[PDB]
Design a binder for this molecule. Structure first.
Ligand SMILES: Nc1cc(C(F)(F)F)c(-c2nc(N3CCOCC3)nc(N3CCOCC3)n2)cn1
Length: 834
């Protein structure tokens, strides 16, 4: 029975009962639950308990130039606390936590914990190499450290537990309901990495609630020739309305045989949902298609001009399409191509996956894969091999093979996109899934995040939740009883909080109406909850923080188009430094997945900029989508919208240039501090300007841009909340802080535009990585996005194909257009929302 209680607890954590059989036509999921057990226990067993327990967060990257500046002493200062006792040691960047530890007693079961958060500075790592330290240098703060005992690893314990042609028969389609009368027909395709190897169509028939053809669609392709990972894709056109897929080769390497009745997905009035092997859970309202399967298996050197040809091909963007020529060139000279890792995606797209002799040659090629493994890891390339263009398990495994060399810091960087890329795997068990399982179980930070990212999908994607539940379930059985306990506390609060949010939204108006009625109602429910509700819970976007009791006094309902709750919690650490509450917004009615994808690319932009020694002061705040159209947002303290700043000085509606500067100086404690704010505004303004431009989310209304009293500017509410055009927002008030009016420069403005250029060129160095992240995010984070047209934006913006000077020129032009437009575009937004 312990087992039932435990599978039920798991079901509760996960949000889906992986033992559900109601929407399946085979045993792939179970098989996969079984398959993943090995990789779990292998990593549980493998992991160092003390290290798993304390999870030091580290990098092996260089300290950026900009941080060494903060320290030229060659000595850093760390404050060590014990109750009131509090010495203040100074140390060397190359010092180790131990050394410094022993060094401290010069003035053994003790360890240094960051004050107020469950973050531990430990292990054989130079202090400079701890992120928290870096974060502290980055923000000009003292490294406050208490000394306490190491957490007991005992709490991390794990519970002991044919040459025939291929054909298919289309029997008919069936729907319960149906506006006019029109013709309908069925299109069957065989697909491998979104390349259709063959296509057959039935004849049209009148569209009645049941339509039958009972036909054999015999394909040109041979059985022998079907590749593992191939999809039988079935679609109804009447305009395409419905789709479903079925893998032609099963998880055991066997050809599919028998009768299938598949409940289809409908197209709303390209994307990754379109490649799912899953069928629609909705049998009562779904369209179905009935089919029958009755058919288990298993040196000359390149001349000079031609290699010039090859090379040109390789240097093209990932979005460049390849001609029949390019493909032959790539494949006939494959042994040459194998020497250019940068060419592997293009080459593997030139393979005729529908000829078994070729696939066999391809695998051979994979054996002489020497240049590839030697290669310095390239995340652009690796990601490209994990997108919708490759269904081959061996090709994808090599990418995954390069991923193995990522340190945890880097895995945290790409974890969301890596998790999203599992939607591009043909089967539920895959090397990437195993990779992701391994690293979460290896590190608690990655685990924590892997937990929520997988739960995000499970809660809101009928198309991949089954696959993801199995992966999450596997993670849960190796994290340890401590993480389980923690996750349970998180799921309880958020599950709680979402209801409160739901009830209130359910009592509240479409218009901007807040009343004591509503707030009373807000506080009452909070009052109920407040009185058990777990004592403490870990903040999901920031696992170091422990959130304590509500400060119901400070909680309110926000005046936003939905009714987000503004909540403030006491910290649960007595070791913490301040009285400051932890502020979290909680909302239903936005799709946070989309916000989640952007802020992660923004974290990726920052890290790229760090490689080139730049810090553009982005503020990609925490955001998790916890369920369908619901999740949480971090509140950056001391922040207001640019629109409010206008409101409070100018009329409620309509726009003065001088206002933002007034606001900053008035908020500033001192001139020293005011001048720091201006400097921070300049960097962050540029950063948002370049980053936003590249992602094509530049044109924004004022209510959706924010600044802190410290001068840090940041955008909000991506994905998308309100909408002559502008590349980005560089308005007169912004110019004014920087010291300019009209077409006149300033030492600061000069500073702003050179930074923009420095920043933009840094990004174009990773043109390929960004194009692929961007295209991937559209496919897995938007509902649907029109393959070639939408993706293409990022090339024009990355100015693919030009040298640096032209690029530099181009971006300065964009700045001029912003200079040209003033308040024009802002004004029209006000009008659109008036
Ligand atoms: N998808 C979404 C949704 C929202 C929200 F909360 F408005 F619904 C937000 C949001 N996020 C915030 N933040 C987040 C960063 O820290 C400051 C507060 N503020 C707002 N405002 C609503 C109108 O008055 C100004 C404050 N909105 C972000 N992304």
């Amino acid at each position: 029975e312990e087992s039932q209680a435990f599978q039920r607890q798991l079901t509760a954590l996960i949000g889906y009962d992986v033992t559900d059989v109601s929407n399946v036509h085979d045993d792939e999921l179970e098989f996969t639950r079984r398959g993943l057990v090995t990789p779990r226990m292998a990593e549980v067993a493998s992991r160092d308990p003390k290290l798993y327990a304390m999870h030091p967060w580290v990098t092996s990257k260089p300290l950026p130039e900009y941080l060494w500046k903060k320290i030229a002493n060659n000595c850093i200062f760390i404050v060590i606390h014990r109750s009131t006792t509090s010495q203040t040691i100074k140390v060397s960047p190359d010092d180790t936590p131990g050394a410094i530890l022993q060094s401290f007693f010069t003035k053994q079961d003790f360890v240094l914990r960051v004050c107020g958060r469950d973050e531990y500075l430990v292990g054989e790592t130079p202090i400079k190499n701890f992120q928290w330290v870096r974060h502290c240098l980055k923000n000009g703060e003292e490294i406050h450290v208490v000394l306490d005992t190491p957490p007991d690893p005992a709490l991390d314990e794990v519970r002991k537990e044919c040459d025939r042609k291929f054909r298919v028969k289309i029997r008919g389609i069936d729907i319960p309901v149906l506006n006019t009368d029109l013709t309908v027909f069925v299109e069957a395709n065989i697909q491998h990495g979104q390349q259709v190897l063959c296509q057959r169509r039935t004849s049209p028939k009148p569209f009645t609630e049941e339509v039958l053809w009972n036909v054999w669609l015999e394909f040109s392709i041979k059985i022998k020739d079907l590749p593992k990972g191939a999809l039988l894709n079935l679609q109804i056109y009447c305009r395409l309305l419905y789709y479903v897929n079925l893998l032609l080769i099963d998880h055991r390497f066997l050809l599919r045989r028998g009768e299938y009745v598949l409940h289809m997905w409908q197209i709303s009035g390209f994307n990754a949902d379109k490649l799912t092997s899953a069928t629609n859970p909705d049998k009562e309202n779904s369209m179905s298609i009935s089919i029958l399967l009755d058919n288990h298996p298993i040196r000359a050197e390149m001349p000079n001009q031609l290699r010039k040809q090859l090379e040109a091909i390789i240097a093209t963007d990932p979005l460049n399409p390849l001609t029949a020529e390019d493909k032959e060139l790539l494949w006939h000279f494959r042994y040459e191509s194998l020497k250019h890792p940068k060419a592997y995606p293009k080459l593997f797209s030139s393979v005729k996956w529908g000829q078994q002799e070729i696939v066999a040659k391809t695998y051979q090629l994979l054996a002489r894969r020497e240049v590839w493994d030697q290669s310095a890891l390239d995340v652009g390339l690796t990601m490209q091999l994990l997108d919708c263009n490759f269904s081959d398990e061996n090709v994808r495994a090599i990418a995954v093979q390069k991923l193995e060399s990522l340190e945890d810091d880097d895995v945290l960087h790409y974890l969301l996109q890596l998790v999203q890329a599992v939607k591009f795997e043909p089967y539920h068990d895959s090397a990437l899934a195993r990779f992701l399982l391994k690293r979460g179980l290896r590190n608690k930070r990655i685990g924590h995040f892997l937990f929520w990212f997988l739960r995000s999908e499970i809660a809101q994607s009928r198309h991949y939740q089954q696959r993801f539940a199995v992966i999450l379930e596997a993670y849960l059985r190796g994290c340890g009883t401590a993480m389980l306990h923690d996750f349970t506390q998180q799921v309880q609060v958020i599950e709680m909080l979402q209801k409160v949010t739901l009830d209130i939204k359910s009592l509240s108006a479409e218009k901007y109406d807040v009343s004591s009625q509503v707030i009373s109602q807000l506080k009452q429910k909070l009052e109920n909850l407040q009185n058990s509700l777990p004592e403490s819970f870990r903040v999901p976007y920031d696992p170091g923080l422990k959130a304590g009791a509500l400060a119901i006094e400070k909680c309110k309902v926000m005046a936003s188009k939905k009714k987000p709750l503004w909540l403030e919690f006491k910290c649960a650490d007595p070791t913490a430094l301040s009285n400051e509450t932890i502020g979290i917004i909680f909302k239903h009615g936005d799709d946070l997945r989309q916000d989640m994808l952007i802020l992660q690319i923004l974290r990726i932009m920052e890290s790229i900029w760090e490689t080139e020694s730049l810090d553009l002061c982005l503020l990609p705040y925490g955001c998790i989508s916890t369920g369908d159209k619901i999740g949480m947002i971090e509140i950056v303290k001391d922040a207001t919208t640019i629109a409010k700043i206008q409101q409070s000085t100018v009329g409620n509606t309509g726009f003065k240039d001088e206002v933002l500067n007034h606001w900053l100086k008035e908020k500033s404690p001192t001139e020293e501090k005011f001048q720091a704010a201006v400097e921070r505004f300049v960097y962050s303004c540029a950063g948002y300007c370049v980053a936003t431009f590249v992602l094509g989310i530049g044109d924004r209304h004022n209510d959706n841009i924010m600044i802190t009293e410290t001068g840090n500017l940041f955008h909000i509410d991506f994905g998308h909340i309100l909408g002559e055009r502008v590349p980005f927002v560089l308005t007169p008030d912004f110019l004014f802080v920087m010291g300019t009016s009209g077409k006149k420069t300033s030492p600061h403005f000069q500073k702003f535009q050179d930074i923009c250029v420095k920043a933009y060129l840094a990004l174009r160095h990773h043109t390929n990585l960004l194009i692929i992240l961007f295209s991937m995010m559209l496919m897995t984070g938007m509902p649907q996005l029109t393959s070639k047209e939408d993706i293409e934006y990022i090339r024009d913006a990355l100015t693919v194909g030009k040298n640096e000077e032209d690029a530099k020129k181009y971006f300065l032009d964009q700045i001029e257009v912003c200079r040209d437009k003033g308040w024009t575009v802002q004004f029209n937004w006000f009008l659109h929302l008036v």
